[PDB]
Design a protein around this ligand. Structure first.
Ligand SMILES: Nc1nc2c(ncn2[C@@H]2O[C@H](COP(=O)(O)OP(=O)(O)NP(=O)(O)O)[C@@H](O)[C@H]2O)c(=O)[nH]1
Ligand SMILES: [Mg+2]
Length: 168
């Protein structure tokens, strides 16, 4: 039974924690408190093969880098998350992708681009613009909402498929 170490990266506030909790625990966190755990695990079936998802939820604050850059070497696939109502977080995708390629020392790292908060009306990042950037990187692009769970399973499952394709 194969285990996949998935790393969720992105700027502060894009919903890295909310996506991980919605996937693992099936509820949306917002106003109320929550217990910190960082490491989340789940058994899933993807394309008829049962596997274990080991998800690392990193912090967006760049002053805390001993938690994110340390585990960039251990991660097998990366969820690069921006929020569709946060132009700066979309711009920052380039910075996270370069940091990953530097640590992994590879041009073909399993990655999925994720535009979160697609339930909100205040969009400032066009879908076609993010599709164009993902095409430039050669990676899938998935729009998600941790609030409604739209696209959440697809984003993490697509990353696993990228990892499986890379391991051939
Ligand atoms: N409307 C909406 N709000 C969302 C969505 N995902 C997250 N949020 C909200 O956005 C805020 C930040 O979410 P959070 O998961 O803490 O973001 P983060 O990327 O883990 N932040 P950090 O980098 O500081 O750890 C919260 O108020 C959360 O409820 C979404 O899909 N839709
Ligand atoms: Mg968080």
């Amino acid at each position: 039974m194969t285990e996949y170490k998935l790393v969720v990266v992105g700027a502060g506030g894009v919903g890295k924690s909310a996506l991980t909790i919605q996937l693992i625990q099936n509820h949306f966190v917002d106003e109320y408190d929550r217990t910190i755990e960082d490491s989340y695990r789940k058994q899933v079936v993807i394309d008829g093969e049962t596997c274990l998802l080991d998800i690392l939820d990193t912090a967006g604050q760049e002053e805390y880098s001993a938690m994110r850059d340390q585990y960039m070497r251990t991660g097998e696939g990366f969820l690069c998350v921006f929020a569709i109502n946060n132009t700066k977080s979309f711009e920052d995708i380039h910075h996270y992708r370069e940091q990953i390629k530097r640590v992994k020392d590879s041009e073909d790292v399993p990655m999925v681009l994720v535009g979160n908060k697609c339930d909100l009306p205040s969009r400032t990042v066009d879908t076609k613009q993010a599709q164009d950037l993902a095409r430039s990187y050669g990676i899938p692009f998935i729009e998600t909402s941790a609030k409604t769970r739209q696209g959440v399973d697809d984003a993490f499952y697509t990353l696993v498929r990228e990892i499986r394709k890379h391991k051939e």
